[PDB]
Amino acid sequence: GLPIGWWIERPSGWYFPI
Numbered sequence: 123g124l125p126i127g128w129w130i131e132r133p134s135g136w137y138f139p140i
Contacts, residue, residue, distance in 0.1 A: 123136070124136060124138075
């Protein structure tokens with residue numbers, strides 16, 4: 123969802139490690 127966080131997302135962007 124957001125480039126920042128932990129790793130890449132499914133739809134787009136990155137996600138958080140929680």
